[PDB]
Write an enzyme that holds these catalytic residues in place. Structure first.
Site, mmCIF file in Angstrom:
data_model
loop_
_atom_site.group_PDB
_atom_site.id
_atom_site.type_symbol
_atom_site.label_atom_id
_atom_site.label_comp_id
_atom_site.label_asym_id
_atom_site.label_seq_id
_atom_site.Cartn_x
_atom_site.Cartn_y
_atom_site.Cartn_z
ATOM 1 N N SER A 88 5.073 -13.036 -10.714
ATOM 2 C CA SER A 88 3.997 -12.152 -10.129
ATOM 3 C C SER A 88 2.645 -12.685 -10.494
ATOM 4 C CB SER A 88 3.995 -10.745 -10.675
ATOM 5 O OG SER A 88 4.917 -9.960 -10.051
ATOM 6 N N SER A 123 2.961 -11.136 -4.967
ATOM 7 C CA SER A 123 3.144 -9.768 -5.222
ATOM 8 C C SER A 123 4.621 -9.385 -5.421
ATOM 9 C CB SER A 123 2.521 -9.009 -4.030
ATOM 10 O OG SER A 123 2.732 -7.611 -4.019
ATOM 11 N N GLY A 145 8.512 -12.572 -13.351
ATOM 12 C CA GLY A 145 7.643 -13.430 -14.217
ATOM 13 C C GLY A 145 6.653 -14.265 -13.317
ATOM 14 N N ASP A 162 -2.881 -5.617 -3.885
ATOM 15 C CA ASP A 162 -2.166 -6.115 -5.034
ATOM 16 C C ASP A 162 -2.952 -7.215 -5.682
ATOM 17 O OD1 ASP A 162 -0.409 -6.339 -7.111
ATOM 18 O OD2 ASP A 162 1.456 -6.513 -5.988
ATOM 19 N N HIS A 180 -0.439 -5.319 -9.890
ATOM 20 C CA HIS A 180 0.647 -4.541 -10.546
ATOM 21 C C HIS A 180 0.785 -5.022 -12.002
ATOM 22 C CE1 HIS A 180 3.130 -7.668 -8.734
ATOM 23 N NE2 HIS A 180 3.669 -7.656 -9.952
#
Lengths: 185, 51
Positions: free
Chosen positions: A141, A156, A139, A63, A33
């Protein structure tokens, strides 16, 4: 730069998951993402230290994304903060795991379930996710989920926060390594 | 940002902050919108970016 460190794209900030390579080519993994619609990646907010360019992106459904390093000089540690990573492994229910992200730093917990489906709405649905009781905040991810010296997954999303507690779902790292033909080093 | 379609069971965790009416910096639109719901529609958007 190592796993957990901040990464910046044109749109926002994420975290580097793991440093990997294929042959003599070095890349890094992060969340899909994060790589979606991103091209260039920098090591600072100033966008003055270039890391590389997006080479792949798989989101929704999966992801994971991968960025090819174009910066020759920046050191590329096969670590997570200073924790060495020497292999990848599949997650299992009750497994003790640790996450590191650029916003919250390192937090620990357990794998509570496998194969979860996570609906991020708007048709963004991800499948085959590892559920854990580890918190995560914006932040974080793409940061690594590890266990010992074992790479386990990529952050994710989820809910709650680090102050009150929360639930975070991770993408299994094996699946990402397999798709790109790369390996941890 | 419109939060009608909220709440959401989960949010991705990239950082693009928004500033709430409670002077809190929300890390992303999903986080912010879930907080609006939880507030029962009392929390509003002050501006985009950190507070």
């Amino acid at each position: 730069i190592s796993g957990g460190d901040a990464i910046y794209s044109s749109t926002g900030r994420c975290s580097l998951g793991f440093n990997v390579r294929s042959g003599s080519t070095y890349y890094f993994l992060t969340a899909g993402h994060c790589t979606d619609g991103a091209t260039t990646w920098w090591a600072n907010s100033a966008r003055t230290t270039v890391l590389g360019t997006t080479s792949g992106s798989s989101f929704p459904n999966n992801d994971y994304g991968i960025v090819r390093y174009t910066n020759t000089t920046i050191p590329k540690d096969g670590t997570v903060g200073g924790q060495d990573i020497t292999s990848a492994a599949n997650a299992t229910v009750g497994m003790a795991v640790t996450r590191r992200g650029s916003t919250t730093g390192t937090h620990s917990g357990s794998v509570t379930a496998l194969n979860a489906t996570v609906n991020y709405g708007g048709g963004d649905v991800v499948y085959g996710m590892i559920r854990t009781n580890v918190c995560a905040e914006p932040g974080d991810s793409g940061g690594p989920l590890y266990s010992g010296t074992r790479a386990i997954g990529l952050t994710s999303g989820g809910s709650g926060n680090c102050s009150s507690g929360g639930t975070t779902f991770f993408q299994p790292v094996t699946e990402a390594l397999s798709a790109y033909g790369v390996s941890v080093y | 940002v419109d939060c009608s379609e909220y709440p959401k069971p989960a949010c991705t965790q990239e950082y693009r902050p928004l500033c709430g009416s409670d002077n809190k910096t929300y890390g992303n639109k999903c986080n912010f919108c879930n907080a609006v719901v939880e507030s029962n529609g009392t929390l509003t958007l002050s501006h985009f970016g950190k507070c």
